[PDB]
Ligand binder design. Structure first.
Ligand SMILES: *[C@@H]1O[C@H](CO)[C@@H](O[C@@H]2O[C@H](CO)[C@@H](O)[C@H](O)[C@H]2NC(C)=O)[C@H](O)[C@H]1NC(C)=O
Ligand SMILES: CC(C)CCC[C@@H](C)[C@H]1CC[C@H]2[C@@H]3CC=C4C[C@@H](O)CC[C@]4(C)[C@H]3CC[C@]12C
Ligand SMILES: NCCc1c[nH]c2ccc(O)cc12
Ligand SMILES: NCCc1c[nH]c2ccc(O)cc12
Ligand SMILES: CCCCCCCCCCCC
Ligand SMILES: CCCCCCCCCCCC
Ligand SMILES: CCCCCCCCCCCC
Ligand SMILES: CCCCCCCCCCCC
Ligand SMILES: CCCCCCCCCC
Ligand SMILES: CCCCCCC
Ligand SMILES: CCCCCCC
Ligand SMILES: CCCCCCC
Ligand SMILES: CCCCCCC
Ligand SMILES: CCCCCCC
Ligand SMILES: CCCCCCC
Ligand SMILES: CCCCC
Ligand SMILES: [Cl-]
Lengths: 118, 110, 537
C-alpha cells in the first residue's frame, strides 16, 4: 500500500553530495517503475528521472543526467538517488512516487511524505 | 522534448459553478488506444494526489466530482462544482516515451 | 514457350516451395493443440497417400502437356475449367492470410535490431501489472490471469487486440504494419516484374540460408537444460484418441497445405520443361525433404517448449493452451530472451522466416500469374507487367481488410476456413477428372516411356480408389464436424461460423456455375451435350 517512506532533512553545501533513500514495501517493487520529482518552494513540479528496480534501467533527462543518479536495491527494497554539486538552485524538496501499471497509464498513484533537502 | 502548456493560469470560480482545465502540446499522445495523460492534485504542504487514470478513468478513492476527457492534442478537465476544500494546484503529466514532463499549473480559488 | 533451362534451378524452386513458413507454423501448433505425441503416428501413411500420388501425377501431367494451369484443362476436360478461377480465389485468400504473418515477421525483424531486445522485460508500453513472467528464485506465483512479456508484445504491441472487442467491433489502424505490407509488396512486385529468369535465379541465394539457420537453431536449442521432457512429450505413442475423434483430419489438412497439391504451383513449374526421366525422382525428393523439414521444425519447437516448461516448473500441456498461431512468436521470443547469446539468434531466425515466406508467397503468386497469362494471350503478349501490377494492387487491397482491422480473429478464420474444404474439393475434383473421366491407361502410356520406368501396380491402384476415398472421407468429416474456434479468450459466434461456412462454400462454387454455363450454352439434349462436351482435344 502507501508505505513509501523517505529520509529526513539534510544540509546543502556548495560542492557536496547527499543520498536520499526511499523505502518501498507492500507491492511488487521489482516490476513497477520508481519516479523522482523536484518541487521548488513557490514553483511547479520538475521531473528528474525514473528507475526500474530489478533491471537497472534508468532514463535520465531534464538537464539532470550530469548531477543526478538513481540506484536500486532489490535486497533492501530501497531506492537511492545520488546527488552532486549541491547548490541553492536545486536546493528544494524531493519526492518519491511509484508509477501505475500499463493499462492504468503509468500514473503516480503512491507518493511519499517528502524529503526537505535545504 | 515534449513540453506541456496549461491554460488558464488562474480560475477564481465561485462555489456552485464548474470549470475546465486544458493541457496542450505537440502530442497526440495516443498510443495503443491509451491516452497518456495524468492529472495530479497538489495541496500546499501535502504531497500530490492522483485524480484521473489515463485521462479517461477516475482515480482510486477520489470523489465522483473529478472527471476528465479528451483525445489527440486537446484535453479537457471538467470538474464538478467543488467546495472550499478542493482548491489545489493541478498539473498535467505526459507519460509518453521516452521522457516525462510535467505541466505548468493552475491556481483555482473563489 | 520458354523453359526452366537447367534442372538445378527447377529443383531449387520445388524444394523452396516445399519448405514453407505456413507448414512450419501449422504443424507444431496443431500438434501441441491435439496433444503432441498423438500427432505423428496416424500421420505418416496419410502424408504419403496425400502427397506422393497427387504431387507425382500433377508434375507428370504438367511436364507432359505444358499448357499452364488453367489452359492445361482444355485438352483434358473443358467442363471443369472453373478450377482455374477456384484455385485463383484460393491463392488470393492464402496470400491475404500470409501477408499479415509476413508483416508481423518483418516488424519483429525490425524491432529486433536494438542491443536490448524488447522481450526480456516489459517497457513503458506494456501492462506491467500482468507482466510477471520473470524467472526468479522461487518468488513467482502464477495465477489464472498471469501473462508473459512475449505474449504482451504479441498482443498489445503489434496486434493491439485490446482495442477490438471481436469481429463485430471495428479496430484501429496500424501505420507501421501498413508501411510493412507496402514494403513487402514493392519487394515482391520488383521480384516478379523481371520474369522466370530472375525467379529461378533468386531461389539459389535463398536456398541454403534457411537450412543453415534451422540447423544452428536446432543445435543451440538441443543444448539447453530441459531438452528431454519436450522430446518425451513429442514422442508419445498415445494409441487412445486416434480412432475416430483424433487429429487425423487436421493432420491431413496440414500435410495437404505443406505439400501443396493442386495449388497451381506444380503445373506452373512443370509447364516449362519436359524434365525427362526425373519427374518421379524430383517429386520423391521434394516430398521427403518437406517431410524432413516439417519433422525437424516440430522437433525443435517441442524441444524449446519442454525446456521452457522445465524452467517454469510446470507441465508441458498447460503452457499457452488458448494461444493460437502465437505459439512460435511467444515461445521462440522467450527462448531468445533467456539465451545469453541474443541479438543474433532472433535476427537470424527472423531473416529465416522472412526469406521462407517470401519464396513461398512468390511461388504461390507465380503459379497463378503464369497460368492467367497462358489463359489470356492478348494479355500475355504485352500487358504482363500491367496485369502483375494490377494483381499486386488487388492483393494488397484484399490484405488491407485483414491488416488494418488490427485483429487476428479474421486471420485465424482464414487459416481454419480458406485452406480446408475448398482446396480439398478442388483436389478431389481434379483427381476424379484425371482418373475417372480421363483414362489412366492412356495417361500413363506416355509418361511410362517419358520417365523410363513403369508406374504400374502402385498408382494404377492408388489413383482410382484409395486416394479419392480418403479425400472424400476427409471432406465429409470436415463438413460434418463443426469447426469450433477459440483465440485469446474469445469464442467465435454463430454468425462468424455461418460467414466462414458461406465463404468456404462460395470459394469453389465457380466450378459448378461454370458447369452450368457450359451445359446451358451447349445445345441439344443432355446426352449428346455431355458426350460431345467432355472431349479431350
Ligand atoms: C490483467 O490485469 C487485470 C487488472 O488490470 C486483471 O483483469 C481482470 O481481473 C479480474 C480479477 O480476476 C477479473 O474478474 C476480470 O474479468 C479481469 N478482466 C478481464 C477483461 O478479463 C487480471 O489480473 C489480468 N487478466 C485479465 C484477463 O485482465
Ligand atoms: C536434410 C535437409 C533438411 C537439408 C539438406 C538440403 C538438401 C536436401 C537440398 C538442399 C540443396 C538441394 C540440391 C540443390 C541442387 C541439386 C542439383 C539438381 O540437379 C538436383 C537436385 C539437387 C541435388 C538438390 C537436392 C536436394 C538438396 C541437396
Ligand atoms: N504453402 C504455400 C502457400 C501458398 C499456396 N498457394 C499460395 C498462393 C499465394 C501465396 O501468397 C501463398 C500460397
Ligand atoms: N481444420 C479444418 C477446419 C474445418 C472443420 N470443418 C470445417 C467445415 C468448413 C470449413 O470451412 C472448415 C472446417
Ligand atoms: C533505431 C531504429 C533503427 C531502425 C532500422 C530499420 C531498418 C529496416 C531494415 C529493413 C530491411 C528489410
Ligand atoms: C490515423 C492513422 C490512419 C492510417 C491509415 C492508413 C491507411 C493506408 C491506406 C493505404 C491505401 C493505399
Ligand atoms: C516503431 C518504428 C517502426 C518503423 C517502421 C518503418 C517501416 C518503413 C517501411 C518503408 C516502406 C517503403
Ligand atoms: C515420409 C516418407 C515417405 C516415404 C515414401 C516412400 C515411397 C515408396 C514408393 C515405392 C513405389 C514402388
Ligand atoms: C460486422 C462487420 C463484419 C465484417 C466481417 C469481415 C469478414 C472478412 C472476411 C474476409
Ligand atoms: C474497420 C473495417 C475496415 C474495412 C476496410 C474495407 C476496405
Ligand atoms: C531484388 C531482389 C531482392 C531479393 C532479396 C531477398 C532477401
Ligand atoms: C450441421 C451440418 C451442416 C452441413 C451443411 C452442408 C452444406
Ligand atoms: C459480410 C457479412 C456477412 C454476414 C452474414 C451473416 C449470415
Ligand atoms: C449449419 C451450416 C450451414 C451452412 C450454410 C451454408 C450456406
Ligand atoms: C440460416 C441459414 C442462412 C444461409 C444463408 C446462405 C447465404
Ligand atoms: C529493400 C528494397 C530492395 C529493392 C531492390
Ligand atoms: Cl507435416
Amino acid at each position: 500500500q502507501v508505505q513509501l517512506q523517505q529520509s529526513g532533512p539534510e544540509l546543502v553545501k556548495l560542492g557536496a553530495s547527499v543520498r536520499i533513500s526511499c523505502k518501498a514495501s507492500g507491492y511488487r517493487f521489482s516490476y513497477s517503475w520508481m519516479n523522482w520529482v523536484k518541487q521548488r518552494p513557490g514553483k511547479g513540479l520538475e521531473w528528474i528521472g525514473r528507475i526500474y528496480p530489478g533491471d537497472g534501467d534508468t532514463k535520465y533527462s531534464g538537464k539532470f543526467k550530469g548531477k543526478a543518479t538513481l540506484t536500486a536495491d532489490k535486497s533492501s527494497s530501497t531506492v537511492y538517488m545520488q546527488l552532486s554539486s549541491l547548490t541553492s538552485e536545486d536546493s528544494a524538496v524531493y519526492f518519491c512516487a511509484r508509477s501505475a501499471y500499463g493499462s492504468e497509464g503509468f500514473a503516480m498513484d503512491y507518493w511519499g511524505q517528502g524529503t526537505s533537502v535545504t | 522534448d515534449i513540453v506541456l502548456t496549461q491554460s488558464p493560469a488562474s480560475l477564481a470560480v465561485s462555489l456552485g459553478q464548474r470549470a475546465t482545465i486544458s493541457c496542450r502540446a505537440s502530442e497526440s499522445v495516443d498510443n495503443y488506444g491509451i491516452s497518456f495523460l495524468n492529472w495530479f492534485q497538489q495541496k500546499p504542504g501535502q504531497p500530490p494526489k492522483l485524480l484521473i487514470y489515463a485521462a479517461s478513468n477516475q482515480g482510486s478513492g477520489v470523489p465522483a466530482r473529478f472527471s476528465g476527457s479528451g483525445s489527440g492534442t486537446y484535453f479537457s478537465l471538467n470538474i464538478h462544482p467543488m467546495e472550499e476544500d478542493d482548491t489545489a494546484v493541478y498539473f498535467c503529466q505526459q507519460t509518453k516515451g521516452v521522457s516525462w514532463t510535467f505541466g505548468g499549473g493552475t491556481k483555482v480559488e473563489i | 514457350r520458354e523453359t526452366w533451362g537447367k534442372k538445378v534451378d527447377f529443383l531449387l524452386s520445388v524444394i523452396g516451395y516445399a519448405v514453407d513458413l505456413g507448414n512450419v507454423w501449422r504443424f507444431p501448433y496443431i500438434c501441441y493443440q491435439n496433444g503432441g505425441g498423438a500427432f505423428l503416428l496416424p500421420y505418416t501413411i496419410m502424408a504419403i497417400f496425400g502427397g506422393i500420388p497427387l504431387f507425382y501425377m500433377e508434375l507428370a501431367l504438367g511436364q507432359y502437356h505444358r499448357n499452364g494451369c488453367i489452359s492445361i484443362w482444355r485438352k483434358i476436360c473443358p467442363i471443369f475449367k472453373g478450377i482455374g478461377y477456384a484455385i485463383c480465389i484460393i491463392a488470393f485468400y492464402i496470400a491475404s492470410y500470409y501477408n499479415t504473418i509476413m508483416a508481423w515477421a518483418l516488424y519483429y525483424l525490425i524491432s529486433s535490431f536494438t542491443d536490448q531486445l524488447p522481450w526480456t522485460s516489459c517497457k513503458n508500453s506494456w501492462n506491467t501489472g500482468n507482466c510477471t513472467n520473470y524467472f526468479s528464485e522461487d518468488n513467482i506465483t502464477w495465477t489464472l490471469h498471469s501473462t508473459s512479456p512475449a505474449e504482451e508484445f504479441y498482443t498489445r504491441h503489434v496486434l493491439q487486440i485490446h482495442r477490438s472487442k471481436g469481429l463485430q467491433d471495428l479496430g484501429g489502424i496500424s501505420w507501421q504494419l501498413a508501411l510493412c505490407i507496402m514494403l513487402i509488396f514493392t519487394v515482391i512486385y520488383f521480384s516478379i516484374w523481371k520474369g522466370v529468369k530472375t525467379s529461378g535465379k533468386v531461389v539459389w541465394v535463398t536456398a541454403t540460408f534457411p537450412y543453415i539457420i534451422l540447423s544452428v537453431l536446432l543445435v543451440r536449442g538441443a543444448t539447453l537444460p530441459g531438452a528431454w521432457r519436450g522430446v518425451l512429450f513429442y514422442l508419445k505413442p498415445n494409441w487412445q484418441k486416434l480412432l475416430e475423434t483424433g487429429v487425423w483430419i487436421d493432420a491431413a489438412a496440414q500435410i495437404f497445405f505443406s505439400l501443396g497439391p493442386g495449388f497451381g504451383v506444380l503445373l506452373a513449374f512443370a509447364s516449362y520443361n519436359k524434365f525427362n526421366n526425373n519427374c518421379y525422382q524430383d517429386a520423391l525428393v521434394t516430398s521427403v525433404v518437406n517431410c524432413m523439414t516439417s519433422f525437424v521444425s516440430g522437433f525443435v519447437i517441442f524441444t524449446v517448449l519442454g525446456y521452457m516448461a522445465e524452467m517454469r516448473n510446470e507441465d508441458v500441456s498447460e503452457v499457452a493452451k488458448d494461444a493460437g498461431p502465437s505459439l512460435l512468436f511467444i515461445t521462440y521470443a522467450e527462448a531468445i530472451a533467456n539465451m545469453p547469446a541474443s541479438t543474433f539468434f532472433a535476427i537470424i531466425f527472423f531473416l529465416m522466416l522472412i526469406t521462407l515466406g517470401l519464396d513461398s508467397t512468390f511461388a504461390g503468386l507465380e503459379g497463378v500469374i503464369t497460368a492467367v497469362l497462358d489463359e489470356f494471350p492478348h494479355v500475355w503478349a504485352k500487358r504482363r507487367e500491367r496485369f502483375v501490377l494490377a494483381v499486386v494492387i488487388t492483393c494488397f487491397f484484399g490484405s488491407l481488410v485483414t491488416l488494418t482491422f488490427g485483429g487476428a480473429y479474421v486471420v485465424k478464420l482464414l487459416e481454419e476456413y480458406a485452406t480446408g474444404p475448398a482446396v480439398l474439393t478442388v483436389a478431389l475434383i481434379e483427381a476424379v477428372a484425371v482418373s475417372w473421366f480421363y483414362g489412366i491407361t492412356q495417361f500413363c502410356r506416355d509418361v511410362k516411356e517419358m520417365l523410363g520406368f513403369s508406374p504400374g501396380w502402385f498408382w494404377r491402384i492408388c489413383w482410382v480408389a484409395i486416394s479419392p476415398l480418403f479425400l472424400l472421407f476427409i471432406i465429409c468429416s470436415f463438413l460434418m464436424s463443426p469447426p469450433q474456434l477459440r483465440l485469446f479468450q474469445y469464442n467465435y459466434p454463430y454468425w462468424s461460423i455461418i460467414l466462414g461456412y458461406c465463404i468456404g462454400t462460395s470459394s469453389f462454387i465457380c466450378i459448378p456455375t461454370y458447369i452450368a454455363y457450359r451445359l446451358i450454352i451447349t445445345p441439344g439434349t443432355f446426352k449428346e451435350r455431355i458426350i460431345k462436351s467432355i472431349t479431350p482435344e
